[PDB]
Amino acid sequence: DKPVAHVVANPEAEGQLQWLSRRANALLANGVELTDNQLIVPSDGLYLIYSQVLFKGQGCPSTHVLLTHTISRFAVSYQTKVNLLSAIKSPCQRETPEGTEAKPWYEPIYLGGVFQLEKGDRLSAEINLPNYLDFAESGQVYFGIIAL
């Protein structure tokens, strides 16, 4: 029936965001393809597209870190890549004051919305700092689409 996918990050693929369809509560059906880490839609139509990432770090260093998460559309007809959904997070305000012990921080980001796509359009869900991802628990990093 509906083109659909819900793929999850490979917890073994450290330092990258490699999507898997091949897990206990993942899905990829009805014409959606996972090719070169992108979700490929099988037909023109409206799609709900969504993704979550979770970042974890230890303490706050001198360089101010900004975490980004973006879902982008490579429109096959126009050979162009456009951002559909995006967000930014700052885990730290100032450096961990020296002498004080660094505590782990956690930052989730969720993105989701409805978009008109064309057959063969390629969707990517990417982050700027993949090593910062946390895969320690299932359900924390995912990427999905639903044809409406």
From Swiss-Prot:
**Which loops or segments lie on the Extracellular side of the membrane, by the record?**
1-148
Modification(s) after translation: The soluble form is demyristoylated by SIRT6, promoting its secretion.
**Compartmental location:** Secreted
All copies of the THD domain together span 3-148
Q: List the disulfide bonds.
A: C60-C92
Protein's UniProt name: Tumor necrosis factor, soluble form
Q: Which organism is it from?
A: Canis lupus familiaris
Q: What is the lineage of its organism?
A: Eukaryota, Metazoa, Chordata, Craniata, Vertebrata
Q: Which gene encodes it?
A: TNF
